[PDB]
């Protein structure tokens, strides 16, 4: 939105678990929801190419 994201603003998704508040949080800006996996360097290079 305006400021860099923080470990506080980056939240993890829950799959197979009821997650009504996140579904309401769709179209919101600050809380960024991530898949808990982080891309490796090789994957990053492959995506870039």
């Amino acid at each position: 939105d305006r400021q860099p994201l923080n470990p506080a603003n980056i939240e993890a998704r829950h799959h197979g678990v009821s997650d009504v508040p996140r579904l309401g949080a769709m179209d919101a800006d600050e809380p960024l929801f991530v898949d808990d996996y982080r891309a490796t360097d090789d994957e990053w290079t492959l995506q870039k190419v």
Binding site: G16, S18, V20, P21, L23, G24, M26
Partner: protein, 63 residues
Amino acid sequence: KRDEKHRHVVNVVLELPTEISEATHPVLATMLSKYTRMSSLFNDKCAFKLDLLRMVAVSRTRR
């Protein structure tokens, strides 16, 4: 009462038809307890609808 809350959520939030309800839908029966507790967000009905859909999906998922 709590049954009035259940009826309200099923008939206004989920807009569910009569032929399906807690007496016939076990996953809905489990989800109602959580859904009634969330007193806000009732304006955004699509969130509850989508959560019901994905709970049905995870329930039907089998290995």
